[PDB]
């Protein structure tokens, strides 16, 4: 059981309570969350604590954006736990609508709640951001939206992919590097490109994102398996290795542990790398904060998922015999 699994990872943002108030008003104003069942269900996820634990460097309005972005991810995600997630062409068309917002085509007044919420998050994200950050993060959003239809293809196939194909789909649908781009933005830093593209930081970024989605795969397996989801590390290992469920969970834990070890080995090289690049003291401080942002995403996501009611509650309040939401908020 998830309660008997810990992964071996290493504060919390002071704005948690203020962000809880803002975010509750925001999801209602945008129409992303309604009244009654959806609202109590949304509240039980505790999106503010995810923001405050996953992005502890964020303060004030920056933490508000983190929580609102998380709200969009989770509400949008669940819209595919139903007929949409078994209809790849329809999923691709819906996600093309969202992608158009990324690249400039504003949704306009009266658009659906998911389009309006995304447009608000994206506008707030890019306001005052460095153009290199905007370009990279725009392509990250594109991958996230485009990957959803491939998860639907895999559901229809009914077998897990091999490891390489699992990673290609799962890294996309998990939000790719978007949590780290968000944490960088919310911390108010800009990583110098020379450091960002070092082999060390590129490997570390990929490792941190893998760690969180794999930790999620383990804890979210119960609600996903009954829905015919196929892009879950435990199912991929079990199918590839012809092993028991316990053997597959053990191997999944090992995939997380080796990535944490790699991350921490490379982190020790970062001061020396900054010196070899001749970065300024301010730049080195921003790189140090970027390291903390990655570390806190890994440790803080796990801290959140052990206390949330999303994964223990989903099989009971939204059983697999019906859709995985109370209200359709995404027109298809
Ligand atoms: C990033 C939020 N997400 C993915 C889009 C919403 C369902 C859950 C998640 C969190 C952390 C790792 C992997 C997935
Ligand atoms: Mg998903
Ligand atoms: Mg999901
Ligand atoms: Mg999951």
Swiss-Prot record:
* Record's catalysed reaction(s): (2E,6E)-farnesyl diphosphate + H2O = avermitilol + diphosphate
Where is Mg(2+) 3 annotated to bind?
216, 220, 224
- The entry's Mg(2+) 2-binding residues are 77, 81
Which interval of the chain is the signal sequence? none
Query: Would you say which domain of life the source belongs to?
Result: Bacteria
Q: What is its EC number?
A: 4.2.3.96
The note on cofactor binding and number reads:
Binds 3 Mg(2+) ions per subunit.
Q: Which of UniProt's keywords are assigned here? A: Lyase, Magnesium, Metal-binding
Q: Which cofactor does it need?
A: Mg(2+)
Output the Gene Ontology terms for molecular function.
metal ion binding; terpene synthase activity
Enzyme class label: lyase
TM ranges? none
* List of residues binding Mg(2+) 1: 77, 81
> Motif DDXXD motif: residue span?
77-81
Q: What exactly does this protein do?
A: Catalyzes the cyclization of farnesyl diphosphate to avermitilol.
Q: What other remark does the UniProt record contain for this protein?
A: The recombinent enzyme produces avermitilol (85%), accompanied by small quantities of germacrene A, germacrene B and viridiflorol.
> Could you tell me which PANTHER family the record lists for this protein?
BETA-PINACENE SYNTHASE-RELATED, TERPENE SYNTHASE
Q: What family does this belong to?
A: Belongs to the terpene synthase family.
Q: What's the protein here called?
A: Avermitilol synthase
In the UniProt record, the gene name given for this protein reads tpc1
